[PDB]
Each structure stands twice: as structure tokens, then as C-alpha cells.
Design a protein around this motif. Sequence first.
Motif, PDB file in Angstrom:
ATOM      1  N   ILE A  16      54.576  17.433  62.333  1.00 27.96           N
ATOM      2  CA  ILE A  16      54.183  17.353  63.769  1.00 27.96           C
ATOM      3  C   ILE A  16      54.873  18.497  64.526  1.00 27.96           C
ATOM      4  N   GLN A  17      56.116  18.763  64.226  1.00 30.81           N
ATOM      5  CA  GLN A  17      56.825  19.868  64.933  1.00 30.81           C
ATOM      6  C   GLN A  17      56.381  21.216  64.355  1.00 30.81           C
ATOM      7  N   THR A  18      56.039  21.259  63.094  1.00 21.49           N
ATOM      8  CA  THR A  18      55.602  22.553  62.491  1.00 21.49           C
ATOM      9  C   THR A  18      54.204  22.905  62.991  1.00 21.49           C
ATOM     10  N   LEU A  19      53.273  21.988  62.904  1.00 21.08           N
ATOM     11  CA  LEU A  19      51.885  22.280  63.376  1.00 21.08           C
ATOM     12  C   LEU A  19      51.965  22.963  64.751  1.00 21.08           C
ATOM     13  N   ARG A  20      52.869  22.522  65.583  1.00 23.97           N
ATOM     14  CA  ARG A  20      53.011  23.147  66.931  1.00 23.97           C
ATOM     15  C   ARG A  20      53.335  24.634  66.766  1.00 23.97           C
ATOM     16  N   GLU A  21      53.790  25.027  65.604  1.00 25.89           N
ATOM     17  CA  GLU A  21      54.128  26.460  65.377  1.00 25.89           C
ATOM     18  C   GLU A  21      52.834  27.237  65.099  1.00 25.89           C
ATOM     19  N   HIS A  22      51.722  26.545  65.102  1.00 29.57           N
ATOM     20  CA  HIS A  22      50.398  27.197  64.842  1.00 29.57           C
ATOM     21  C   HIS A  22      49.516  27.005  66.091  1.00 29.57           C
ATOM     22  N   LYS A  23      48.216  26.991  65.923  1.00 25.36           N
ATOM     23  CA  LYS A  23      47.287  26.782  67.080  1.00 25.36           C
ATOM     24  C   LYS A  23      46.559  25.460  66.863  1.00 25.36           C
ATOM     25  N   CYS A  24      46.977  24.724  65.870  1.00 23.84           N
ATOM     26  CA  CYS A  24      46.344  23.411  65.576  1.00 23.84           C
ATOM     27  C   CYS A  24      47.181  22.306  66.219  1.00 23.84           C
ATOM     28  N   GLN A  25      46.675  21.693  67.249  1.00 25.01           N
ATOM     29  CA  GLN A  25      47.450  20.616  67.927  1.00 25.01           C
ATOM     30  C   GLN A  25      47.536  19.380  67.009  1.00 25.01           C
ATOM     31  N   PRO A  26      48.722  18.942  66.629  1.00 25.27           N
ATOM     32  CA  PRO A  26      48.885  17.753  65.739  1.00 25.27           C
ATOM     33  C   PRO A  26      48.870  16.429  66.505  1.00 25.27           C
ATOM     34  N   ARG A  27      48.373  15.393  65.888  1.00 24.14           N
ATOM     35  CA  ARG A  27      48.343  14.060  66.556  1.00 24.14           C
ATOM     36  C   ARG A  27      48.431  12.968  65.485  1.00 24.14           C
ATOM     37  N   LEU A  28      49.307  12.009  65.641  1.00 24.56           N
ATOM     38  CA  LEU A  28      49.406  10.939  64.621  1.00 24.56           C
ATOM     39  C   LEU A  28      48.293   9.917  64.871  1.00 24.56           C
ATOM     40  N   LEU A  29      47.433   9.745  63.912  1.00 23.40           N
ATOM     41  CA  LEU A  29      46.307   8.765  64.051  1.00 23.40           C
ATOM     42  C   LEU A  29      46.762   7.442  63.437  1.00 23.40           C
ATOM     43  N   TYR A  30      45.834   6.572  63.050  1.00 20.02           N
ATOM     44  CA  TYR A  30      46.169   5.238  62.413  1.00 20.02           C
ATOM     45  C   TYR A  30      47.648   5.192  61.969  1.00 20.02           C
ATOM     46  N   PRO A  31      48.322   4.059  62.063  1.00 18.32           N
ATOM     47  CA  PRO A  31      49.754   3.916  61.684  1.00 18.32           C
ATOM     48  C   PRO A  31      50.291   4.986  60.722  1.00 18.32           C
ATOM     49  N   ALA A  32      49.444   5.638  59.965  1.00 22.06           N
ATOM     50  CA  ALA A  32      49.952   6.705  59.050  1.00 22.06           C
ATOM     51  C   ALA A  32      48.904   7.811  58.814  1.00 22.06           C
ATOM     52  N   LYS A  33      47.936   8.007  59.694  1.00 19.86           N
ATOM     53  CA  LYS A  33      46.934   9.116  59.458  1.00 19.86           C
ATOM     54  C   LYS A  33      47.268  10.296  60.377  1.00 19.86           C
ATOM     55  N   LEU A  34      47.211  11.500  59.846  1.00 15.39           N
ATOM     56  CA  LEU A  34      47.555  12.718  60.652  1.00 15.39           C
ATOM     57  C   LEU A  34      46.353  13.668  60.721  1.00 15.39           C
ATOM     58  N   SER A  35      45.901  13.983  61.916  1.00 19.58           N
ATOM     59  CA  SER A  35      44.736  14.913  62.079  1.00 19.58           C
ATOM     60  C   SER A  35      45.227  16.279  62.569  1.00 19.58           C
ATOM     61  N   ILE A  36      44.565  17.329  62.149  1.00 19.86           N
ATOM     62  CA  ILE A  36      44.960  18.711  62.558  1.00 19.86           C
ATOM     63  C   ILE A  36      43.708  19.506  62.950  1.00 19.86           C
ATOM     64  N   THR A  37      43.847  20.430  63.871  1.00 20.47           N
ATOM     65  CA  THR A  37      42.675  21.241  64.336  1.00 20.47           C
ATOM     66  C   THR A  37      42.682  22.644  63.706  1.00 20.47           C
TER      67      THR A  37
END
Length: 65
Positions: A16-37
Motif C-alpha cells: 500500500i505504501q509502495t504502490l503510492r511510489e507509482h501512479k497506481c492508487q492502491p486500495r484494500l478491497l474485501y477483508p484481504a483483496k488488493l486492487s491496483i490501477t
Amino acid sequence: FSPETMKARRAWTDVIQTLREHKCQPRLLYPAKLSITIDGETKVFHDKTKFTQYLSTNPALQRII
């Protein structure tokens, strides 16, 4: 969940903190699902392995992340 499921979202924490180092906004989905742009097409992973694999097949991120 604490022992197994939390590790799933726990991993989503480190990236979550690394994705911010890119242009893909990170977001935690379902109790354990992670989506990236990326390239507009949205992708998601419910297991830290599947994610690592997504990059294992796309070194571009591995070098940056």
C-alpha cells in the motif's frame, strides 16, 4: 483469520505504501483483496503470491517497487 487472513491484508500494507511510489492508487478491497490501477485496466489479488506472480511476469514493477 488473525494468523492466515491478516497476513493477506498485512502484505497489502507493505505494498500500500509502495504502490503510492507509482501512479497506481492502491486500495484494500474485501477483508484481504488488493486492487491496483495500471494501464487503466484494473486488476486485483486475494493472495500475496498471485500479486508477486503478477510482477514476476512484469519485471517493470519488480525493479521499481
